[PDB]
Amino acid sequence: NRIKLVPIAPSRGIIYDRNGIPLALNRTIYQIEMMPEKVDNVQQTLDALRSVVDLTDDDIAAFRKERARSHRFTSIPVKTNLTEVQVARFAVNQYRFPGVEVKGYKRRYYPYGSALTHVIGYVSKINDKDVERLNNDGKLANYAATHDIGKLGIERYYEDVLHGQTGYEEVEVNNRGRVIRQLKEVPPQAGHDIYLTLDLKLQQYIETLLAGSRAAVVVTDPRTGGVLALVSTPSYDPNLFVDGISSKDYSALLNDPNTPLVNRATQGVYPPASTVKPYVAVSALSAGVITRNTTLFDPGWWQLPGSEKRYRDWKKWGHGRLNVTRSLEESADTFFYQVAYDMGIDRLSEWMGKFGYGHYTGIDLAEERSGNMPTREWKQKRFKKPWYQGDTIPVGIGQGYWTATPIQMSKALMILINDGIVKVPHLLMSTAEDGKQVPWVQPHEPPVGDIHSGYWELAKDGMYGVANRPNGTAHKYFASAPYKIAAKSGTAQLRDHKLMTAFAPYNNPQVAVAMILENGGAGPAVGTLMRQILDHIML
């Protein structure tokens, strides 16, 4: 009688929000299955199982077809999703059905569904590119009994910790290959539980605010860089994929022109526009090409020296006399056109790159785009034409070749809040299992510019003005708040993309928000939605 070794799959770790609410759970699902070769009389067995587990003609139909579409000595399921009564009935009848097995499979469950789709992700059936990627990473050995895998979001980024360590059992089998006894069991070890920085009730609220629009919101705590909410709408139900998604259901997702499969927060690539003016400002003050007192007269436009090329301000007849404070307050373009010209693309890209633009943020998701912070070398490689000085000008106001993601906006915003300290936006607070907590540790990111310098306060004071002073572009959204709001909006490029960044309270910022409504959103203005979000958080 031969002794077989049989892998035991591990139980997948739980994902919890910042308050211990489980966001990704396991459910056991029961089926009876058989290897027909190991079943003496298949027909007799099927018919007697009508009585025992309420086996139906359709169940048998599905059985024989799946029996065809399967390799020799494959275990064919006979009946799936058994009720507990049905398992108990089969259990007390097990001895009549040698070669029929009852088995439990842990499946993944997402209780809050579409509110956490892009950030949490889903696990679903392993396919051939999963196999390949596991075999390159040299992890395949540990999946001998594992059949699902993180496909995106946190479920994929942390697949390795969530999965656990496969175990194994020694079982005795008879002449016909049926297990009669278990000799030894070396149990698996559950994957680690992971605790996220997310606030689930804040994420559901924001998802409610965003209803109908193509939008992304990132909310962070700038004191820690944690992601309190990262939502992309429209979304979809991650539970659809867990037990295998309908191709009807799946083609409906891909064919949605509102592209709900896209994580807009990390893969949405847009011109950052005016939202960059605070960072361009800090950069110019540090570079020394402007001053707290630098002033220019804006007629509503700006002309490139040695050229008839004129760039426009949004105010048709100008903002009159502008310094950096007032330019941030009223989101003047002319001031920043000039700043860009003086900075030069070289210095300008180098500084904006230090705020994170054009680079991956370091967030712990695998779905991410880097956007584009243009350089001479990049323009050369991408178009084999050299850099012209008029290419620098729109970069001053976050346009031209410049594109960024809302998670990049977030990183940059937090740097400004922290006076050049670079905090990576992250979702993981800690790991666990087996009882030992490992906290998420910030990678070494050297600061931007200089901490002691007073330019950080200057640019932030301007954002306070945007939100609070009568000439600020966002006064109507934020002035009346008890806590002090600082903000900076932008408009990009069908209708225009509406962007808003903000943080609160201004004295001791507890929350940072970058958000964007594609083509203006479906209802409220982005400034109204920002107020409501900052209200919900601060009460």
Ligand X SMILES: *C(=O)N1C[C@H](NOS(=O)(=O)O)CC[C@H]1C(N)=O
Q: Which residues are catalytic?
A: 274
CA distance 15 to 225: 19
- Residue with Cβ nearer ligand X (120 or 513): 513
**Which part of the chain contacts ligand X (CB under 6 A), choosing from 103-111, 296-304, 414-422, 483-491?**
483-491
Query: Among 203, 361, 489, 501, which residue interacts with ligand X (rule: CB under 6 A)?
Result: 489
CB neighbours of 250 closer than 8 A, spacing ≥ 6? Answer: 240
Residues composing the chain: 539
CA distance 161 to 148: 14
Dihedral (CA of 312, 317, 321, 327) sign: negative
- Residue with Cβ nearer ligand X (421 or 525): 525
Amino acid occupying residue 531:
R
- Residue with Cβ nearer ligand X (468 or 473): 473
Query: Among 123, 273, 365, 504, which residue interacts with ligand X (rule: CB under 6 A)?
Result: 273
Residue 344: HSE in the Cβ half-sphere, 13 Å Cα cutoff: 5
**Which part of the chain contacts ligand X (CB under 6 A), choosing from 10-18, 233-241, 487-495, 513-521?**
487-495
DSSP string, 369-399: ---B---HHHHHHHHS----HHHHHHHTTT-
- Residue with Cβ nearer ligand X (61 or 479): 479
Q: Count the residues of the shown chain that bind ligand X, applying the rule CB under 6 A.
A: 10
**Which part of the chain contacts ligand X (CB under 6 A), choosing from 55-63, 186-194, 362-370, 484-492?**
484-492
- Residue with Cβ nearer ligand X (219 or 530): 530
274 binds ligand X (CB under 6 A): yes
**Which part of the chain contacts ligand X (CB under 6 A), choosing from 175-183, 302-310, 450-458, 485-493?**
485-493
In the block, tokens 């490139």 appear at 304
431: left (phi over 0), alpha (psi -120 to 50) or beta: beta
**Which part of the chain contacts ligand X (CB under 6 A), choosing from 183-191, 203-211, 354-362, 488-496?**
488-496
Site string for ligand X, 383-422 (x = CB under 6 A): --------------x-------------------------
Compute the least distance from the CB of residue 319 to ligand X, in Å.
Answer: 11
Compute the least distance from the CB of residue 489 to ligand X, in Å.
Answer: 3
Q: In terms of Cα–Cα distance, which of 507, 223, 266, 210 is closest to 409?
A: 266
Compute the least distance from the CB of residue 277 to ligand X, in Å.
Answer: 7
- Residue with Cβ nearer ligand X (318 or 490): 490
Which residues of 188-293 form beta strands (DSSP E)?
189-190, 194-196, 215-221, 226-233
301 binds ligand X (CB under 6 A): no
491 binds ligand X (CB under 6 A): yes
314 binds ligand X (CB under 6 A): yes
CB neighbours of 67 closer than 8 A, spacing ≥ 6? Answer: 36, 76
Query: H-helix or E-strand containing 191?
Result: none
- Residue with Cβ nearer ligand X (510 or 532): 532
13: left (phi over 0), alpha (psi -120 to 50) or beta: beta
CA distance 38 to 537: 61
Residue 521: HSE in the Cβ half-sphere, 13 Å Cα cutoff: 23
220 binds ligand X (CB under 6 A): no
Applying the rule CB under 6 A, the residues between 461 and 480 that interact with ligand X are 473
Applying the rule CB under 6 A, the residues between 345 and 384 that interact with ligand X are none
197 binds ligand X (CB under 6 A): no
202: which 2 tokens? Answer: 């804040």
The DSSP call for residue 448 is S
331 binds ligand X (CB under 6 A): yes
Q: In terms of Cα–Cα distance, which of 425, 488, 445 is closest to 281?
A: 488
Q: Of all residues in this chain, which one has the CB nearest to ligand X in the complex?
A: 274
Query: Among 490, 509, 511, 534, which residue interacts with ligand X (rule: CB under 6 A)?
Result: 490
Compute the least distance from the CB of residue 526 to ligand X, in Å.
Answer: 9
- Residue with Cβ nearer ligand X (31 or 331): 331
Note the residues at the interface with ligand X (CB under 6 A). Answer: 273-274, 314, 331, 333, 397, 473, 489-491
